[PDB]
Amino acid sequence: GSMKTVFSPLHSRRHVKTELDGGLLIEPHEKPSRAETILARVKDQALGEILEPEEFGLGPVKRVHTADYVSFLETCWDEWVAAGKRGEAIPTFWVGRGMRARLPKDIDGRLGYYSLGADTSISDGTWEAARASANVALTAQKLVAEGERAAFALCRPPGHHAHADVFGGYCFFNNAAIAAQAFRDQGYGKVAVLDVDFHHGNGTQAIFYDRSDVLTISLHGDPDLVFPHFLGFEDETGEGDGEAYNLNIVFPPDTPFSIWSQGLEKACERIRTFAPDALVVALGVDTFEEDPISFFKLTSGDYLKLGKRLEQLGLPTVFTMEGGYDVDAIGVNAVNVMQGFEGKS
Amino acid sequence: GSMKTVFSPLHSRRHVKTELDGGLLIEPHEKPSRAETILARVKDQALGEILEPEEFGLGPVKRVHTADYVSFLETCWDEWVAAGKRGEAIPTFWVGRGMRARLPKDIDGRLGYYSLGADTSISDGTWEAARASANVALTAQKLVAEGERAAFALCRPPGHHAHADVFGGYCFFNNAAIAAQAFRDQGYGKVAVLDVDFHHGNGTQAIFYDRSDVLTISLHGDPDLVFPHFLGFEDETGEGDGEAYNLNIVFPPDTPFSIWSQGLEKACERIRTFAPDALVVALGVDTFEEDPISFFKLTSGDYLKLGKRLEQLGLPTVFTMEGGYDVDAIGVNAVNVMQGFEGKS
Ligand SMILES: NCCCNCCCCCC(=O)NO
Ligand SMILES: NCCCNCCCCCC(=O)NO
Ligand SMILES: [K+]
Ligand SMILES: [K+]
Ligand SMILES: [K+]
Ligand SMILES: [K+]
Ligand SMILES: [Mg+2]
Ligand SMILES: [Mg+2]
Ligand SMILES: [Mg+2]
Numbered sequence A, B: 001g002s003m004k005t006v007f008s009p010l011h012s013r014r015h016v017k018t019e020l021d022g023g024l025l026i027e028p029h030e031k032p033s034r035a036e037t038i039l040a041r042v043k044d045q046a047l048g049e050i051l052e053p054e055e056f057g058l059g060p061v062k063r064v065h066t067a068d069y070v071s072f073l074e075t076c077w078d079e080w081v082a083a084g085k086r087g088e089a090i091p092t093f094w095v096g097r098g099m100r101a102r103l104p105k106d107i108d109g110r111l112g113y114y115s116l117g118a119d120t121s122i123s124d125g126t127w128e129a130a131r132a133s134a135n136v137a138l139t140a141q142k143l144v145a146e147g148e149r150a151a152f153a154l155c156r157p158p159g160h161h162a163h164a165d166v167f168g169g170y171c172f173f174n175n176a177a178i179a180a181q182a183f184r185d186q187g188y189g190k191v192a193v194l195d196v197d198f199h200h201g202n203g204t205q206a207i208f209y210d211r212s213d214v215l216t217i218s219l220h221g222d223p224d225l226v227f228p229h230f231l232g233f234e235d236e237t238g239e240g241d242g243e244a245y246n247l248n249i250v251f252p253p254d255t256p257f258s259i260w261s262q263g264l265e266k267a268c269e270r271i272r273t274f275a276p277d278a279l280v281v282a283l284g285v286d287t288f289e290e291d292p293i294s295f296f297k298l299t300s301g302d303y304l305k306l307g308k309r310l311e312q313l314g315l316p317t318v319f320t321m322e323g324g325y326d327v328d329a330i331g332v333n334a335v336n337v338m339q340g341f342e343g344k345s
């Protein structure tokens, strides 16, 4: 083994109490016990050294995200409370079809402008946890750049749904995209980001969509049926310089590893012909057969197989944690990917 | 003078229990007591004959709204319930900036595709109430077309935020736009729609935006500060043939009638030069100094002056009821407009 994990205790600063779901406010799926359970499994399995993140500042964040958005995330909660709202910060209105993509002054307008959904409440400490999660990913990228074959960025909150200036799907900063852009800024000519979380990495796709230096691939449930609904379809192959440098691979309900791994192989062949200098894996274990909000049927053992197949790509590899919501198995599942990468069958 | 009022007892079929507001689910502002209080004031003041709407079917609604959107509103609640959701039907995800305006299959995706906000819950009876409210406006239009100088369509739910295929702002069918298009379909060459509700009539603006046969004017609170946030700015003057046939007049918080009436005069001047054959007034009394969600400062007496000034345009006039959420005064305020129109000071 010996794969290092980066973990920040500041993730628990994000501990919201409400999530809009089926017309009700429920206890959030993206809860701090997710990160604590994975961390406990990392320790129990003696995967490798565990370290806290270094502070990289907002520079590397703003290589991917707009300055207006970064500013909004820092002040959103304070403005929400100042305006007198009594719940957590949830968007109520947005730029509907036929409306202008124009940034307004009021906090409700800004919330809607910068969001793609209302299940991602903001409260005190969300900014701090998001900042820490991006630094977790950047610390993992640094470890790999300086000689580690791979590293595990135990990110929370997750990142892959966040656009340059849009938050949602429990994500604020796109940790995987930030790590990929760090590779590029450090002179890695080509980077691939492979998204194995159950949901489409729409944020990552959007950020590099017109670019051929960063190849983006996502396997995910059919957006006709599940979040994010309005991106992730297989006809989205990129634009401009980036045409043919994005690949979406879609699956229907009940898809098992025997079928999902065929898409994995197609994604692997695409990476191989792209021949990147570094690989970022946006790893969600919500592909699990017990995941409460997803519809694939991977077993815990399949994650060993996934990790083994990823190692065979022979690339410097940064894993960023995304989704996965069966907390009983989340640690067994996530660490299985790392152990399969390191040689366990 | 006397004015007839069209009222549907079917408005009570819309009776939702939740509204997303400031991160909480609260009792809805747009409540049945609004319509019942106005009707009781219409009776107590003996304004004129009260009658129920005629059923015109969806034909006239579909002159304004798309077939797909009208189908969605009919089935939305049933699909939501069949999908297992336990609350009222509230959008959770939508077409964020950078995503595709593409209709998906899942009801959550459809809900988001067809909405601009999350404060407008759908439940059993919403479809029937929306239909009845459109018929209320169409009956008033018929009364005027057949000889009445003016008629009061006591619509609930309101309409002016609804686009051809977007609902929100408590609106589903754009009653004012449906009445305007009915005038046009019956051979009235030119129609003006004047929106004195506190909020921008973005739906009416969008529906006629590229047309010169239907002049749309709205006075409203600055959308930089209040809903609908992403339309309503004074630089939106129309497009194509519709250029110069849309007019937005914006005011900041605390604006009193002494200032607001100056914008009203500007709108009346624009109407006079347009010289329409019929007038539809989308009437909200949320401009009232005690409205709980708005920031203008009209008094109850100012509505008599409003009614009088609108009569002086000398046009066949349909009033469609929009917003206004201080139930204590909503009856006095709205009927004051009708009474001022009939010569009461
Ligand atoms: N209360 C809304 C229902 C659940 N939310 C939808 C998907 C959010 C994204 C989660 C994820 O794991 N993305 O990778
Ligand atoms: N819970 C949302 C806060 C208050 N609602 C927003 C404005 C809806 C438009 C109402 C209206 O009267 N438009 O004319
Ligand atoms: K994915
Ligand atoms: K790309
Ligand atoms: K208005
Ligand atoms: K127009
Ligand atoms: Mg506001
Ligand atoms: Mg759904
Ligand atoms: Mg009062």
Ligand SMILES: [Zn+2]
Binding pocket: A197, A198, A199, A284, A286, A322, A323, A324
């Ligand atoms: Zn996921």
Ligand SMILES: [Zn+2]
Binding pocket: B197, B198, B199, B284, B286, B322, B323, B324
């Ligand atoms: Zn209003």
